[PDB]
Symmetry: T
Subunit: 135 residues, 12 copies
């Protein structure tokens, strides 16, 4: 059981909460070890690169945890790539997106995702991992 | 550590999709809480006033709240205002993916004042919310 | 067959053209009897009470003639409960909601109802009964 | 006492789709019910908007009630609303299917605000229930 | 000089629904006013959209001025607007009642953007003032 | 007898069609004389001055022909003043206000005016005068 | 000799500790004390009641309608949401005054609409708990 | 193999204002010659009457024949026409001569598009012939 | 001590309830005397004049009772001027603005005002005076 | 004549991606079909696909410099990209927009295009044939 | 080479950053002299007065730098007068008008202006002068 | 020296093929103008959103000012707005044409609310005036 953890634009800028992307990678590694699954963490500011990673996960029938960053609210292309996924897709936001600007309260990904976790910080990733471990 | 799980209108009607009843949900939440070293108090009411009362009590006791308000999520400013008193973390839960249904379900009065929102992860949404609170 | 006639908020205030709810209850009961039906007519200003009456009608698989009053335009919770009904559900308004304020022109119940009767006075209940006598 | 039943565009096409009742059979159902109630029913169908307006003009002059199913014209025609505004005798709008359980544009009616009452989603029986109201009022 | 006065749905029913000037009286008064101004008015009424479309085609084909009261079709008919867009001679839109002191859906018109001008709420005299404009126009 | 023709902002700028405001006043007065009416034509860019003129017409119970210019689409204050008028009120626009921007297609004046003339040029005033002579 | 009903909706029993920067530090019991004193000063009798239940509020409005007694209403969250409450208040023959403690227009946009305002005699917003007292003074004058 | 080509309001007035020199009489002939070349037969008709258009569509539904439809202004306004067209089981292709999206916003909504097989817009009168070719390639 | 009562466009036309603006000035001055305050009541149809008065109140740190009339729904200039006020600002409307047309249900002044009194007739002013006497 | 057929994001996934919506024909097969139709029409067709907005912009730029007509299916970018529209506005030779699925029978957000207003023509919902029909249009006025 | 700087409602209130209107007029005239231009800076809280100043600039064919204050978002009349201008028109806002309330993000003046400078403080005026010097 | 980043988004490499000045001519033009003000301008262009995000990140880490013309991404990219939100040094948004005299969708900007200021419609000089603002704000 391999879970794909895909981070979109600006997410490599974490810390620089105060948890850096390197620290998040480490946290996911340990949680994956506890849950008895493999987790691959990827980050790109490139929409095309994210599309390719979804495509691979579609063909490999592997679960995806996706934090699309700003592309969440804007990209039909990313939504359409995600629609190919037969394994579960969990949308993740670190901050509570409904406490911010109104334009952030709409998502192209949410309707086609299995579930969404919002505002639970970095823990949102680990909780999504646990959902997939027990499903 | 005491955690309140509060279920709103129609949630007592669980599995009467899907299969899991409210009693079975209560038992799962209590079992997971015990493993995490927490105590969970699970309540359900179709009455807005009763929900408001439980929120007020949680505000006075500064206890965390896992809230599934059902249909009141999209309609009740009064429930939002009650939840605004809470000093301890508030997590909003929905069993179904609220964004894969009607457009009126894609707005929540509770979300902006909640700490976090878990949607569409089924009944396990409650248990993941419990684990978050045990880790904070 | 048992037919449930459920009236929402402010409907116990009928009269003060001048038919009271007590007169309405009796008129519905007599009309249903002539059609070979039993009419159970109940009114409440409490949403929680209305939800409970819907739950029972869902479990007993009984037809519901519903006039939710103001809750027609506001309650997602009542819609979700009515969504459970397997037997026909008929929405009734005494006045013509389309000839009044614009907010009365939306109903949360209509999309999940079997049918809707509007503006035909108290006889709207009687015509709803006659539909149920035929179907199905 | 005579009551006018007026059907708009596409309503002559009743049967092929879905209930499974034809317009001829609907005419027979309404007439049988009207006589029983002590009323006379004139049931007419046209795809032409100009023909519906003329039938409504005559109904207004004769001060006769109108049971109207305008079809798609319910949502689009201001002229039809203006004609129905002349009616001094009661007007009951009828839809066969539940108009609110379909597309959103069907959920608005130009006729509803000026009608006495509206019956929606009760199938063919909606016409008969409309007649019974008129026998009372 | 011919001026086309075209009345749409429900306007044959003038003298009811709202004061009590019939359409025949409207035809008679427009023709009297047209004669005084040195014009010939062709006044016609129909509840049929196709007929109104045809009359407008004729007025475009003959390059003749149009005074148009479309009734309910004012707020609804794109077809009528497209037909009117073909007109090279002036077009005046007329409403007898004040359309802005009524329902909000009446405050939009498909014809107004493509007309020369619009007269609203001046009663039956709106037609007569539209004729007078066309006596100097162009 | 007495008819007030009130012009709002930028209407003194006519010419630089081609007809200037001085010539318009002359046209209106000549047309009013032929109909057996006296026309008082006044122009101001000041909202306060327009309200004052409308207040006087309300007190004197005299008909008003009003071209409020830009204030047509923006001024509730002007609308409220015109509401006091008992004698008829004719709203006039020189250009076809519906063949331009969408914000010009709303008028605060229209719902409370007896009638509206639009797009009939300078002659809009004259036809408005002719309506009042018959009423 | 003249009765004025003061009706408080959801969450108003929580006055004192609930969002103090928005509603103040005065307790509901102290509010009851302040209103009753001011009413007697004006020659009126004030009956002050609070409920989190919509049904209970509807009932109090009905009774006020039958008795033809004035109502001072702070519906709380139900201001922006309840058509049922609006419909009940429409029965009132005696004046209805809508009261908000906080300035409802200086906050979220959804608070800037009220189902109650169009059918009330008048509305007092953002003048604190004194809004109640000023509403009493209007009724004593009318 | 009969294909119905139905033109709505104002389409009888083709080539009177101007782009656009081909008349409706000549368009009818172009469609028929192209249809014959593709081994099909086109029945091209035009009416300003909605009732007449509805009648032609009813017949097409009962005969189970494909429809190529340019409804003119009724595209954006007629629910009745939509409802009649929904009865069609054979392919329905919406056609517009000009680019409907390069004009007024209200022309960017079609009641017909959702219930049609496909839509051809802005390719001139050749839109008709390309719609014919779609049908010929799916015989 | 010094409370400013400022009335906008058309409010000099009160009476033409039958309470005149002269009577309103008298009532306010009477009520201010009972509460131990001095009330300076002023009316103008000119937006510019009202802005000037707001500026003066801002510089003097004096409370304002404001009925802007039609400018309530239309004037951002007046909103920005009133934003300068450090002393309390009470918005007043004589009629119930929410029982009328929909455009009246929006106020540019409400969000920056201390409070709003609507639909309590002429007494709204006197109740607003009483609030200020308590602060 | 040289015609450019450009496919946007996810269009390289044809055959596998939601087949009940887009069909079972792969992108490689689409390339072969277009080349077969082009040869019959006496044209030369260059078919290219990219998931990258930048690469698509570059192909549009080149087509503008060479004044070659473009058949474009932008995929998801259709409803989102102003940048693509601004590139396409630079084309002097015709631009035909193609959608495989009937975009108006689906979600409402798909019923708007940034590309449609600046395009010459638009073909929607005729499947893979849409591309071939666009080819013939360009051939008949080349 | 004459440039007209026209300041609208509330702009005389600058200071009470901390740059006053007098200081602004001083800074504009310094920059005008260095660029070989003549700057006429004028302020009014009166809409009618602003309309008059742009009428003069229209007649003289002189460029305008306009900061209309709250009238930016509300005045069609001001837009209509500015439409007459043959010479360039630059719209200026001192603050970032897009970082505030939503109603401020719409301008009636922007569409008819040559250019718009926003959020660059007092220097927005001086940078507008420098544009007009090269045009 | 005092470094100023000038970042151009999609389609801006295509300048001069409505206008006349090419992008290369613009780069050289900005550089010389910056030097005269005692600044050093680094002018960069990309049609790739990922590349613009990269350049914005580096500007945030170095705390250097940014003059940004994001092209079509102005109206569409939340990602770019979020990256620009990290900037502590001033940010100036630039549009060559008057974005308010064109289509309605161009009148909304995701970047404007988070920018220090916005210069629109002043042609190629908009870049130069932006540099001059930064010269006074060091
Ligand atoms: O006392 C008040 O002003 C309020 C109380 C409430 O509970 C809120 O729902 C209302 O929007 C404001
Ligand atoms: O080929 C098509 O019609 C489509 C392809 C896509 O990738 C979708 O984003 C688009 O909405 C429809
Ligand atoms: Cl969506
Ligand atoms: Cl919210
Ligand atoms: Cl709904
Ligand atoms: Cl309506
Ligand atoms: Cl239009
Ligand atoms: Cl209005
Ligand atoms: Cl309301
Ligand atoms: Cl549709
Ligand atoms: Cl506001
Ligand atoms: Cl567009
Ligand atoms: Cl604008
Ligand atoms: Cl924004």
């Amino acid at each position: 059981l391999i879970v794909n953890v895909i981070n979109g634009p600006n997410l490599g800028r974490l810390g620089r909460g105060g948890t850096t992307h390197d620290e998040l990678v480490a946290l996911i590694e340990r949680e994956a070890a506890e849950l008895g699954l493999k987790a691959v963490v990827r980050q790109s500011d490139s929409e095309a690169q994210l599309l390719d990673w979804i495509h691979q996960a579609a063909d490999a029938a592997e679960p995806v945890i996706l934090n699309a960053g700003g592309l969440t609210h804007t990209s039909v292309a990313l939504r359409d790539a995600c629609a190919e996924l037969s394994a579960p897709l969990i949308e993740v936001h670190i901050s509570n997106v409904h406490a911010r600007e109104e334009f952030r309260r709409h998502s192209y990904l949410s309707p086609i995702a299995t579930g969404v976790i919002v505002g639970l910080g970095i823990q949102g990733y680990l909780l999504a991992l646990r959902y997939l471990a027990e499903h």
